[PDB]
Symmetry: C6
Subunit: 304 residues, 6 copies
Amino acid sequence: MIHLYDAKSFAKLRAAQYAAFHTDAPGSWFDHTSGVLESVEDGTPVLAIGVESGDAIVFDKNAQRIVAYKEKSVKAEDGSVSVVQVENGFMKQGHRGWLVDLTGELVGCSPVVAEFGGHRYASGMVIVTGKGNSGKTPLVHALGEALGGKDKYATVRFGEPLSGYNTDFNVFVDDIARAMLQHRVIVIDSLKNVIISRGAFDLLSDIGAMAASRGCVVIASLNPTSNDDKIVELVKEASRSNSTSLVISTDVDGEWQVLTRTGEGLQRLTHTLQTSYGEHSVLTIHTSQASGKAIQTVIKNDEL
Amino acid sequence: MIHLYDAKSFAKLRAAQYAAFHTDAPGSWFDHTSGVLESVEDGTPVLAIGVESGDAIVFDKNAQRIVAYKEKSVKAEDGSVSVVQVENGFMKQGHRGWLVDLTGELVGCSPVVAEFGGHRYASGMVIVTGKGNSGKTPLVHALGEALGGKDKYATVRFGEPLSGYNTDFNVFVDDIARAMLQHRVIVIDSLKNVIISRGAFDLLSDIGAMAASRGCVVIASLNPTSNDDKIVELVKEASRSNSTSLVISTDVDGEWQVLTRTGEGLQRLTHTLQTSYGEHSVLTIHTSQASGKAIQTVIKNDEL
Amino acid sequence: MIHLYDAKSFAKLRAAQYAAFHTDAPGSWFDHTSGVLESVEDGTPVLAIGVESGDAIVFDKNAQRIVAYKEKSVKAEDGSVSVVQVENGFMKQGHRGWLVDLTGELVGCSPVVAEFGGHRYASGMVIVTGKGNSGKTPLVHALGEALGGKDKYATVRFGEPLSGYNTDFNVFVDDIARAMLQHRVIVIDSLKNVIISRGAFDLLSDIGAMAASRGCVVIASLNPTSNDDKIVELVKEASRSNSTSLVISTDVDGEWQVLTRTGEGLQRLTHTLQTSYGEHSVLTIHTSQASGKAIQTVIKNDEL
Amino acid sequence: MIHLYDAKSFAKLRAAQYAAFHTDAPGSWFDHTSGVLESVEDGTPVLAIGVESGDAIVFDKNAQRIVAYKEKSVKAEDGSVSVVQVENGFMKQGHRGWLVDLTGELVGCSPVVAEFGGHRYASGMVIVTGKGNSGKTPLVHALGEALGGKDKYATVRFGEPLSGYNTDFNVFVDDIARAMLQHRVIVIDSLKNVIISRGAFDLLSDIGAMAASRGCVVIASLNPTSNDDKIVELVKEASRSNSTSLVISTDVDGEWQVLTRTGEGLQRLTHTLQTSYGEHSVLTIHTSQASGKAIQTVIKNDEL
Amino acid sequence: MIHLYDAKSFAKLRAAQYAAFHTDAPGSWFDHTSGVLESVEDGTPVLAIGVESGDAIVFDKNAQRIVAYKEKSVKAEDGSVSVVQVENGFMKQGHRGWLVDLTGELVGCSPVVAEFGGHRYASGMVIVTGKGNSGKTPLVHALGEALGGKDKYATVRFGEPLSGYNTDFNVFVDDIARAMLQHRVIVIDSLKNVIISRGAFDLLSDIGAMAASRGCVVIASLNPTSNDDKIVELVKEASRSNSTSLVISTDVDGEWQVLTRTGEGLQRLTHTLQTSYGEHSVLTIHTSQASGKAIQTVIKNDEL
Amino acid sequence: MIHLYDAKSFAKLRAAQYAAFHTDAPGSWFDHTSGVLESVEDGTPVLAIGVESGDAIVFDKNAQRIVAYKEKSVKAEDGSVSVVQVENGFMKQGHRGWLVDLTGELVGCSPVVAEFGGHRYASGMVIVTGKGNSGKTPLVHALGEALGGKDKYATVRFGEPLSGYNTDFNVFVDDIARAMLQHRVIVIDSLKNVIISRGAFDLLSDIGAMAASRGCVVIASLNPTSNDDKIVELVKEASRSNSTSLVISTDVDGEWQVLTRTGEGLQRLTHTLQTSYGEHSVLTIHTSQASGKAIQTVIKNDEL
Ligand SMILES: Nc1ncnc2c1ncn2[C@@H]1O[C@H](COP(=O)(O)CP(=O)(O)OP(=O)(O)O)[C@@H](O)[C@H]1O
Ligand SMILES: Nc1ncnc2c1ncn2[C@@H]1O[C@H](COP(=O)(O)CP(=O)(O)OP(=O)(O)O)[C@@H](O)[C@H]1O
Ligand SMILES: Nc1ncnc2c1ncn2[C@@H]1O[C@H](COP(=O)(O)CP(=O)(O)OP(=O)(O)O)[C@@H](O)[C@H]1O
Ligand SMILES: Nc1ncnc2c1ncn2[C@@H]1O[C@H](COP(=O)(O)CP(=O)(O)OP(=O)(O)O)[C@@H](O)[C@H]1O
Ligand SMILES: Nc1ncnc2c1ncn2[C@@H]1O[C@H](COP(=O)(O)CP(=O)(O)OP(=O)(O)O)[C@@H](O)[C@H]1O
Ligand SMILES: Nc1ncnc2c1ncn2[C@@H]1O[C@H](COP(=O)(O)CP(=O)(O)OP(=O)(O)O)[C@@H](O)[C@H]1O
């Protein structure tokens, strides 16, 4: 919905967003939204995500797909009215994204999802990319395990010529939806076949906000393989604007750079990670500051 | 509608447009249009805006979406006839934009929306853009607060991978319509995912006139990230022709240039703004001339 | 329809086309077609113009839109048959343009619409463009007033982020049709949003011929802003081939050059105008030869 | 249909094609097909041409449009079967082009349409083009009158911002069809708006064969105005492959070069024309050899 | 269908493919397939070819178009099932290409179609192309006569602005289907208007296999006129991969190079042809080795 | 489905994926999945593959196409639900790929399909490409025979102008499905006509995963002929990301290099092959290390 502000209420919001990343307990936002979700009347639509065609499928709090749901309206304090309807397994009325308010007045945040090795990581979408010899898949799994901490991370596999890999987009968004509804740390191995159908474009622009609102983190590998400048710019835009955080490889093998967005219009943070391989290619992240647009852009041209 | 002129009535029109920006009390046009809107019969369609498909959703004077409205025709002074009809929540007959006359013979104006720091600001659409390190988001919010003055400003959030951000275009236009019907100062944070569906193209060409007719101001951040010459020219065209005013960053951090259109075919005004950050990135605009097309173009190439 | 000719009937035609521009009384063609129109049976469709989709809306002699009209055919001398039918407000049978013959055997002319400052001006479509500091809007209004002479000119406003400006294409062509049905001097302030839907392409291809047939003149500002070669070439094409006359700015502020097509197969004329500003930006045109395609192409490259 | 040949029957065909251009009486083929057309049962479809959409309208021998025609089949000696059906003014079964055999075994000819100034001219389509100052419209009309000889030529006007000019493609193909059915010499002023809908593409590839089969000549002006390499190649392809003859301007004003195709796979002929203007821009062609592909290509790059 | 192999059956297949070109009696495969076709039940669909839309028309063994055919299924040795159905003149079920097995286990061959001047020529599609002064049309006809030998060759004429030339794609495929069903040597004069609808793309990828399976040869002229790199690469791909053989012009007038594919994955053969003109441009081919991919590519760039 | 992991379950998975390629008995995965398939209830849909339009056809365990199958759902451990329904021969509900779980928790593997000449080869999709004089076709057949070992390999022929070659995409995917359902070693001779319809894009994205899941290998020749950068990049992408293994030619005729993906997140292996020709072009592979992305990219540019 829309929000109204004066100098004072804006200063307050800025303070709360700052706290959502820097001082709240890591993973607390996820626990809070998990509660809001379990307070939902059973069978009520809580999330809608676009399929290949541009249509959306809808799920309930138990990650069950709702095939039918008679029209229902809800007027928010905003004055606006939200209407949801599901016919034959597809949304007839409503919108993509969360169909229940998980944030209230706490919007534009980057809820800390976890702390590891002395650094706080943001919820939302993290794109792992870069050129060079550092492997993306091993890094995505090591980050998944690290941010998970005491919790197991969820792995969504898509579009790789390996055994058991799903290659159907519609199954992919269904896997993604279920993961976000049930797990704080999510790994997506291969955004590649996504980088185009209306569904893929929707996913690219919707997932980061979906995750940030839930307080969960989605870690997706994006190999900028092609040298075709039209998708190169797409990968770069995804890395710059549809991602809450960016993890990109450097000149030095095994070393990565993390760029974190801490809130709407706030400064981006940056830090470096060292990594190494153990048996069967299992990678470990070793544990042993603000950046301006100038810096941001320099990192981005690495994609060229 | 169309208007007829001879030298004398054209001169009177030019004098009136001049006063609409330079001498009318700031924000008085907004108060005037609020009265016109309130004098509308309850349930009568006053505003139509396009959704993603290119279809239009319609609202009444109370920012409530009209789903059913029997065909009704009105013949204007012009002799032309306006016909409106709404079926199943969508405009069957009519046009995008204001469905009631908010202007009469006072057309082609840039109704002054507010005065701040000794400068008059126009209603209509303001695009905040530019390259460099000066942040756009902090600026749109500071400008929203400053032009709001005694009034709170409305914030429409769209397409950012942050908590509570809507990413569905159809919800976005619903938020925009309601904001313009109820508030004089609006902030749109992120025109990014707009820069393409028919709905997005409609918004870009419709919003400035909608707002200028209402006497409200829509301050939209537009980060010219991509270097893909096709959207680059789209961003530049938007900044040059679809905006009533332009606020662009300079070589010096914290400093901005404001290019204001004062009326149809009138000269543009320019002035500079100095700004600084305080706690939690809250930005403040400090407060302590005509330009030609050549100057205009020079600023525009900053976009490259 | 088609016309048959031999050396003699061809010479007569060229003599008559020459007269239509060079010796006929200014604005006499418009008075004549006004006569043809008014002598039409009430309700008879007289003009069809394309809407956005490519469909056409139809008007009667009083600029009223015909929503229903039973199929009716007419056989001309040509032997050809014209069939017109209107269903649910849209043309089911017929063609875009004038539905009644306003020309007969007198075709291929640029009927003189007015004489001002010692120069004869042609009816049809005039595109006012060019790069530089010379203002397009002040110029079209000044031309409208001057060619209007004793008569007021009609102003059609479209696609500008200013008050009261319509931005819906379908309302635009309805405005245009009515203006041509009722006035000899018409100004369109902004073909910009036209420069693409089938309706827009249709308008660019139809308007010039429509106006010339009626003996009215349509003066349209076309700011060649974008540097995107695809539309830049569209602006040139429109300026070169869809315009009966071209008024383009020069290196000297306030100075313009006029290129006039005087008839089918005839030479273009050229003359220069000096102008100056008075109060509130009201512009005045001061009063106080054939060209070859070489000259014409040179002017055209000013668009680059 | 298909044709079978052995060395002897092929040599015979080659001899007949040679005679169709070089020795038959000018215009005799037209008279022959005129007879074949008048021997057609009244109301039977003889010609089908594509409209904008890609559908085709059909005419009878009197250039009357057939709106209904119950399915009918005809087996040619080829063994093949030709079926024609017209429903609601549109061909339901059949093909574009002549629906009655006008040629028999005499195919691949370039029937001499006329002789003038010591040169034989071919039927089919002639495209008049080129850069420079020589005017296309005056030349098309002078050629029309010259080839007409004792007969008047038919003029089809399309897409020019002049009085009485039709701008609707569907009316244009109807004018073209009628002209080919009733006249040996046809002039089309402006193929411009054709150079894209399926109808325009069809016309470009169909007209030359339509005319060549009838023994009529279609003279169309094609101004290679745009510098957009995609249509430049289109104009060049039209001039090279969809035209039976090409008339192109040279470095010297008033001088033209004619390139004539004399038959399928035969050598092209070339000659030069001198011209001059009389009163009201009436142009006269003064009256007082084989070329290879090398030569052909050189002429074609003139279009660049 | 699919075929299984071990070293031994693969060796036998390679030996059989070798003999299909090098040792079988010229044109014997065509005689063989004629017998297979004649043994088909009357009315049974034997061949389907695509029309412009991408739909397919179907024929019986007597080159008669089938408009109605009740669904019928046949299970091949492969285990697969072929189902055919024809409704309202169009294939409802089935596939493009031969609907009956003309090959059995003899697949991947280039059945020798004829021997002339001491050289064996393959069935399938032959594209005649190249730049320079050597004429394509005279060559396809001379080759049609030479490979026909004791038999007349079939000529399918398409898309040339000459008398009796069909320009409708749907008639073109009907002519092609019938020719291949009834004649061993076919000449297609003009693949030009093909080089795009789904039907045209289908023809390019289907014709070579259709003909090679029948044992017939289709000699198509392809004039690489345009310099538009996109169709240039299309012409080159057609010449390289969609043709069983390629006949291309050299630097010397009248001299051609013949590149023949002898089987799947086998080596290509090359030989040179000298030619000369006689009366009325009738060309005669005078009669008085393996190449590598490098040579292959060299010839191909001649197309640039 | 999705899988949850912590450090320990992840290490086990990587150990198992390593084993699937490095130590499991060659071809044992295929025997295992053959077991899963045969234990499926007759009639149960087991595999869905896309046809040209983007729709999917479905097969049972016996490679028979299912035309009708009433909606049936199944809930996996994942909690997710799989729903399959087939109407009129097409999948109404379900997804492309395997409709029955062939992998369970064992995902992301490249199951060893065979061992030949001291090298283990992976199941999944192998693309055989490269520039130069080394023949693709002889190589795929030689690999098919070698990896076949004691078993015959299945050959799927598509898009070549030779006898018996199918050129219809829908028959192609039916051939492919049947081959994977019934054979461990499969060769596709020509993905060329695939490199675009939704079906083609689907195939390129699905086949590798399908084959790897089954434990079968699909060897496809892909001749990178065109120099059109758009498809050149499509060939690289397919070679880089849609292939489980890549076999590409070198500077030395007869010599190839093999790049094998050994598992999800694992390193690629590389080895070189020498080959030679025997009778009738039958090729023999002679029998007698990890790579980094740098190495991999260098190989890829050989495509340019
Ligand atoms: N306290 C502070 N001091 C200096 N700069 C600050 C600041 N707080 C915020 N900023 C700057 O404000 C800017 C905020 O970003 P914006 O320019 O609005 C684009 P964004 O929306 O953050 O990302 P986007 O363009 O990908 O959507 C950044 O340059 C940030 O560094
Ligand atoms: N009094 C004055 N003296 C000098 N120039 C004036 C003037 N009044 C207006 N102008 C110029 O007239 C021009 C008016 O704008 P125009 O070029 O006609 C269209 P616009 O207002 O720029 O809208 P647009 O950019 O969307 O097309 C500007 O160059 C303005 O500076
Ligand atoms: N008396 C004359 N002397 C010299 N040139 C003349 C002339 N009369 C006409 N022309 C030329 O003939 C042409 C007439 O204009 P048009 O009818 O438009 C034919 P065009 O200009 O060749 O094609 P177009 O439609 O692209 O402009 C112009 O070049 C005009 O200058
Ligand atoms: N007797 C002869 N002596 C020399 N050349 C001859 C000839 N007869 C015909 N030719 C040449 O044969 C060629 C015939 O043209 P082709 O190369 O087949 C292309 P076309 O079909 O004529 O035109 P197109 O490519 O635009 O469709 C021309 O180069 C012509 O000069
Ligand atoms: N005995 C032999 N000695 C050397 N090279 C041979 C050979 N037999 C076959 N070849 C080569 O093997 C290759 C066979 O062709 P491939 O590249 O596999 C596909 P193609 O037959 O060219 O069809 P395509 O061009 O449509 O893809 C050719 O380079 C051929 O010269
Ligand atoms: N033990 C190890 N030592 C060094 N590198 C290793 C490694 N194990 C795996 N890698 C590297 O990690 C990557 C594993 O391949 P993938 O799973 O495909 C991730 P990627 O290659 O970064 O993305 P991709 O899918 O585009 O190939 C490769 O670069 C591989 O070389």
